[PDB]
Design a binder for this molecule. Structure first.
Ligand SMILES: CC(C)=CCC/C(C)=C/CC/C(C)=C/CSP(=O)(O)OP(=O)(O)O
Ligand SMILES: [Cl-]
Ligand SMILES: [Cl-]
Ligand SMILES: [Mg+2]
Ligand SMILES: [Mg+2]
Lengths: 228, 226
């Protein structure tokens, strides 16, 4: 019953960090379309489990973006499973996913799962290092990864720039080739202005790091794209 | 595009070989559901080209299985682009797709393309060495590759054993977990009896090099199954 093609904004929270309960509550009731519990690396099941319990009470859909088999926790409304399409190591595309299925096939069949075709386009971030992504891409390299996602009919193509604003032109061209995939963009969105700019091309903008750096400023990204 | 969920039998041909006399024609007129142009130890644009000119004239859908970017040729009803799910080389999982999209994006848009999830389950064959496949798999491994296939939305999961018959129990168990894709089985089918046996679990049986070894016998695999 969760339709990402109707979404416009999502906050991505890092279970490795701590947020005041007051802020976590404010983010869940902010009007964002989803609260995603992310991770990238070093995540632990206990932090994920505490966060699940803290966000589940709210009406907003809570999503667990799976980044480690040890950190799959029941209780979330949805599960996003990333596949790093430009990874140079099969583990981040399919390998870890096969081990998870082998180990938790049953737990996996009982949840709503959505695969995300990730394209990590910032060569200098923790995510690119970890996943051995060939992240130094020209725009047509990115557009081609988007075409690959559209061909596999991955519900989500996520252009990931991490802590930097990505080339807006690459967001506009990616969007132009996606006909079924929902385009998620994440990267340097810290306020109303940037939020509004990227929301012009992405189907969904992801605001994450900013919540920890300047909370009040990051909160305005919601009204910035859903407001009057 | 042609609907593979209705198929039951397909012959897969090696564009590097040629059938004698009118055998290609009898095969394309046999009742099989599709003729797939494949090939091992790589293919060349020339053989594929020549094969395409031969099979496009018939009603049976003709499919090019794209195992090499350099051998793509326009003119087929369908193009299957494999992802070797158990490959250790990302180039066989997503790289081929990305190259085709980057180098032949406009050709890709004008053709009907189907992404197939491949699982090479025979560790002792050309395909496995060529794709660096982790092919010494137990049954629960295969079952898990099939789940990944569907997670990735692939319309086809192709369980490949090449030159030999695969464990019939593996076929039955993979058919059991696939809730939304079509199960292709390939591997050592050379006659009516074995084709019938694997057709009990697989959605589509692929009969390949048996057509060069014993044509009359491979031809009976169509009726055995349909
Ligand atoms: C275990 C399993 C079933 C599949 C493996 C899942 C995979 C491929 C995970 C890697 C996904 C990553 C690095 C996501 C970025 S979170 P982010 O956007 O917050 O970036 P950051 O944490 O700041 O590095
Ligand atoms: Cl843990
Ligand atoms: Cl005909
Ligand atoms: Mg809730
Ligand atoms: Mg024809």
């Amino acid at each position: 019953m969760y339709d990402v093609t109707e979404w416009k904004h999502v906050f991505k929270l890092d279970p490795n960090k701590d947020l005041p309960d007051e802020q976590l509550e404010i983010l869940c009731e902010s009007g964002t379309d989803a609260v995603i519990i992310g991770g990238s690396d070093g995540v632990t099941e206990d932090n994920v489990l505490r966060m699940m319990s803290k966000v589940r009470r709210f009406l907003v859909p809570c999503v667990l973006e799976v980044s480690a088999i040890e950190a799959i926790v029941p209780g979330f409304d949805l599960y996003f499973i990333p596949s790093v399409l430009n990874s140079k190591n099969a583990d981040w595309i399919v390998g870890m996913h096969q081990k998870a299925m082998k180990e938790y096939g049953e737990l996996m069949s009982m949840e709503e799962i959505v695969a995300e075709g990730y394209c990590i386009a910032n060569p200098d971030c923790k995510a690119a290092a970890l996943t051995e992504a060939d992240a130094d891409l020209n725009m047509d390299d990115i557009v081609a990864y988007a075409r690959v996602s559209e061909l596999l009919q991955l519900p989500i193509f996520y252009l990931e720039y991490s802590g930097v604003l990505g080339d807006i032109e690459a967001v506009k061209k990616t969007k132009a080739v996606l006909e079924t995939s929902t385009l998620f963009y994440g990267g340097g969105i810290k306020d109303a202005e940037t939020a509004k700019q990227y929301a012009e091309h992405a189907d969904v903008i992801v605001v994450g790091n900013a919540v920890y750096e300047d909370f009040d400023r990051a909160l305005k990204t919601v009204a910035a794209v859903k407001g009057e």
